Design a protein around this ligand. Structure first.
Ligand SMILES: [Cl-]
Length: 317
C-alpha cells in the first residue's frame, strides 16, 4: 500500500531495501548477552564534535546509542549498527521502534525509563510475532540504559553541548532516519568474513561512501587479522571519512580525558583517523599491528583533553 510508504522518493526506498538486504552473520548466545553490554561507558564523546560534525555519508558502528549521538553530529545519510552480540542488535532494534513512536526526545527517554515501561512493553508486544525475545532484552538492558540516559543529560549540561537525547533538532534528525528505515541493526563481527565486507560491496553497488566508522575500543581486543584488513580496504570512503575509536592503555602517552571517571575507572582516550590513512596502516604488513601501535607511531596527541588524530603514515621497517 503506497499510502503507507514512508520514503520520500522511489530511489530512497530502493536504497533502503538494498541496505536492508546486505549479508549478515549468524550470531549465537554468549556471555556478553547481558544488559551491561547495551550501553557505552565513554563520557567525553563531545570531544569528537569538531572532527565529525557534518561529515555526512554513511555511518557504520559497533555498540549502541552512542552511534546515534555521533551520527546526528555528522548528519549521516544512513546508519549501520553492526554488532556481534545478539543483545546489542536487539536492543538497538527496540531503540529504533521507540524512536519511530516517540514524537519528542522526552517520549523516547520515557519509553526506556521506569515511567514508560508498561507502555513500552505493550508497544513491543504488538510490534513482533515473537515479542518476548524483545521484552526480555528490554528488561535486561533498561536498568543500564536508564542510568546512561541520566549520565548523558548530566554530561550535556556539564560540558555544554547538544546531543540527540537533549536537543530537539538532533533528536528530530535521528527520528527522521528511524522512520525512513535508515537505521539498520545488522549482525556482524569486526573479525568476520561476511558482514563488514558486505557493507562495502552494498555501498559500492549503490554508489555511496562511508563517512564514519566507529569501533569504540573494540580494537584493544585483537591484532588486526586478514579478514578485517580486507573488509576495511573494501569500504568505499570519502576524503574526509574518519575512524572513531577509544583506547585505555598507555595513559602516560594517551591520557584519559578529564571527566572519564563518571562511567568507568579504566579509560578513555579518544582517537580519530582518516579511513584512507587507516587503510594504509592495515596494508603495511606490520606484524602484530594493533590500534595502540598505530597511535604510538602515527598519532598527534592532545594530552590535555585526551584526544589524538592519527595523521601520520606507516614508515616501512
Ligand atoms: Cl550513549
Amino acid at each position: 500500500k503506497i499510502e503507507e510508504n514512508q520514503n520520500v522518493s522511489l530511489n530512497e526506498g530502493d536504497i533502503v531495501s538494498k541496505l536492508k538486504e546486505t549479508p549478515q552473520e549468524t550470531l549465537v548466545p554468549t556471555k556478553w548477552d547481558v544488559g551491561d553490554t547495551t550501553v557505552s561507558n565513554e563520557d567525553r564523546l563531545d570531544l569528537l564534535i569538531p572532527h565529525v560534525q557534518n561529515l555526512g555519508n554513511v555511518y557504520v558502528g559497533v555498540g549502541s546509542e552512542q552511534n546515534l549521538t555521533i551520527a546526528a553530529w555528522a548528519k549521516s545519510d544512513f546508519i549501520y549498527l553492526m554488532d556481534f552480540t545478539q543483545i546489542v542488535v536487539h536492543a538497538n532494534t527496540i531503540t529504533i521502534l521507540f524512536l519511530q513512536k516517540s514524537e519528542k526526545k522526552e517520549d523516547f527517554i520515557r519509553l526506556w525509563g521506569k515511567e514508560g515501561e508498561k507502555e513500552a512493553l505493550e508497544l513491543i508486544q504488538v510490534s513482533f510475532s515473537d515479542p518476548e525475545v524483545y521484552k526480555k532484552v528490554y528488561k535486561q538492558a533498561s536498568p543500564f540504559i536508564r542510568k546512561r540516559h541520566k549520565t548523558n543529560l548530566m554530561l550535556s549540561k556539564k560540558y555544554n553541548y547538544k546531543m540527540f537525547q537533549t536537543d530537539d533538532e538532533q533528536y528530530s534528525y535521528i527520528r527522521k532516519l528511524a522512520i525512513e528505515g535508515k537505521i539498520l541493526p545488522i549482525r556482524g563481527n569486526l573479525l568476520g568474513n561476511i558482514t563488514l565486507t558486505g557493507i562495502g560491496n552494498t555501498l559500492k553497488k549503490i554508489g555511496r561512501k562511508v563517512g564514519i566508522i566507529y569501533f569504540s575500543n573494540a580494537e584493544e581486543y585483537f591484532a588486526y587479522p586478514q579478514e578485517f584488513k580486507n573488509s576495511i580496504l573494501n569500504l568505499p570512503v570519502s576524503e574526509s571519512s574518519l575512524v572513531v575509536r577509544t583506547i585505555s592503555v598507555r595513559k602516560d602517552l594517551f591520557p584519559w580525558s578529564p571527566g572519564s571517571e563518571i562511567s568507568t575507572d579504566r579509560g578513555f582516550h579518544y582517537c580519530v583517523q582518516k579511513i584512507s590513512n587507516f587503510q594504509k596502516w592495515l596494508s603495511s604488513g606490520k606484524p602484530g599491528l594493533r590500534s595502540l601501535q598505530v597511535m604510538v607511531e602515527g598519532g598527534t596527541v592532545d594530552k590535555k583533553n585526551g584526544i589524538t588524530v592519527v595523521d601520520k603514515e606507516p614508515v616501512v621497517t
